[PDB]
């Protein structure tokens, strides 16, 4: 898997590949790893499929009731703490990383890391097996003040670059743009991926 989130002025862009594997076998080649936790709050799934889906199901439930009690959309910090606490309490039994990003009236567009029960805000963040091969790329390619389109292009290029190199990553790139107005869903097909040196 290769997951990625990028903050911009009015919100966030989140991306993921589409490969679900079981050893060297592709089980699902078109999985959408960008799972909604609330209207305007999403998480990118990685690691154990069963663990990631379980944590997402519980976080969306906790956040739904939290939102209805505060008579307000939950804060992205609250959604990040929700996921983080589950990942931390069960870190010995869970083997999943759920990146949390979205939008708020208070702090606007924010990107969070939940790796092993930790919590960290990032201008952009990457995860999954595929992220290992694009650290140098994202370090060279990231520039602050990127537009939502520039964020989608940074996310698409970085994920395609990882998809080529990583056996556990491939398929299609799913893009999601969370903003005050709402959420936009894009899909970049395996035919339409950006091309780079592949020999």
């Amino acid at each position: 898997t290769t997951i990625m989130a990028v903050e911009f002025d009015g919100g966030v862009v989140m991306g993921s590949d589409s490969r679900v594997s079981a050893g060297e076998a592709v089980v699902n080649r078109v999985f959408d790893k960008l799972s909604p936790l609330h209207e305007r709050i999403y998480c990118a799934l990685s690691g154990s499929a069963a663990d990631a889906q379980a944590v997402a199901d519980m976080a969306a439930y906790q956040l739904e009731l939290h939102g209805i009690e505060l008579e307000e959309p939950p804060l992205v910090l609250a959604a990040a703490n929700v996921v983080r606490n589950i990942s931390y309490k069960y870190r010995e039994d869970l083997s999943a990383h759920l990146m949390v990003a979205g939008w708020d009236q208070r702090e606007g567009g924010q990107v969070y890391g939940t790796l092993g029960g930790m919590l960290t805000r990032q201008p952009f963040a990457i995860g999954g097996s595929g992220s290992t091969f694009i650290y140098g790329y994202v370090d060279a390619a990231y520039k602050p003040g990127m537009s939502p389109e520039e964020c989608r292009r940074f996310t698409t290029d970085a994920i395609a670059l990882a998809m080529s190199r990583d056996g556990s990553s491939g398929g299609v790139i799913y893009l999601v743009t969370i903003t005050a107005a709402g959420v936009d869903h894009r899909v970049i097909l395996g035919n339409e991926l950006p091309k780079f040196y592949d020999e």
Partner: protein
């Protein structure tokens, strides 16, 4: 096992073989791997036969209590969730790999549920030791909005490829077609092996077996 699913223009087709194996020995030549959940929801089981049998039985029973209370036809999302949350809780020790297919107010759906509790909504899928032979046929010839006759044909071929290619699979192809109007359970829809014939002359003349003791209890 070779279990498979498909989503066609008017519903879902579920396919299964009839082999149960006990360590390289065929124990059953014709078992039923396609199980009822609700009138318009069926499930294929692969793995530890007792785990597939009991987790299908439990969710079917939970769906009867669901439908009786709600007064509505059950949703395929409910069977997927009830199954996942149960399997996840057991952490993969309940070895049931399932293909859930069905039709509700939101159309036809096909899901793959794994023993650890992970799931996927797919247009076609295959599970079991012969899943790769079936998944090759499905990848090779699946087109969206297939006709019932075209979908049945592809499904039979997908299960058959697993029957002949996987040593852990054999027997006949059982199928189930699920449409808005209900489900048609096509048992032994295809038999890739013609009736096995022998020149069996193994008759024993009465008395050939040496008997030491004989007691007769009238009933």
């Amino acid at each position: 096992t070779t279990i498979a699913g498909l989503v066609f223009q008017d519903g879902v087709i579920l396919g299964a073989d009839t082999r149960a194996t006990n360590d390289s020995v065929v124990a059953d030549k014709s078992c039923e791997k396609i199980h009822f959940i609700a009138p318009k929801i069926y499930c294929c089981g692969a793995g530890v036969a007792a785990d597939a049998e009991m987790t299908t039985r439990m969710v079917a029973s939970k769906m009867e209590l669901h439908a009786l209370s709600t007064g509505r036809e059950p949703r395929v999302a409910t069977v997927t969730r009830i199954l996942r949350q149960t399997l996840f809780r057991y952490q993969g020790h309940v070895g049931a790999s399932l293909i859930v297919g069905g039709v509700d107010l939101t159309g036809p759906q096909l899901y793959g549920v794994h023993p650890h509790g992970s799931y996927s909504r797919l247009p076609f899928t295959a599970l079991g030791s012969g899943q790769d032979a079936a998944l090759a046929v499905l990848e090779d010839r699946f087109q969206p909005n297939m006709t019932l006759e075209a979908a049945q044909g592809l499904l039979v071929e997908a299960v058959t490829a697993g029957i002949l290619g996987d040593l852990g699979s054999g027997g006949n192809v059982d199928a189930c077609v699920i449409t808005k109007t209900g489900a048609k359970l096509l048992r032994t829809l295809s038999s890739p092996t013609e009736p096995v014939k022998r020149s069996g002359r193994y008759h024993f003349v009465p008395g050939t077996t040496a008997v030491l003791t004989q007691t007769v209890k009238p009933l």
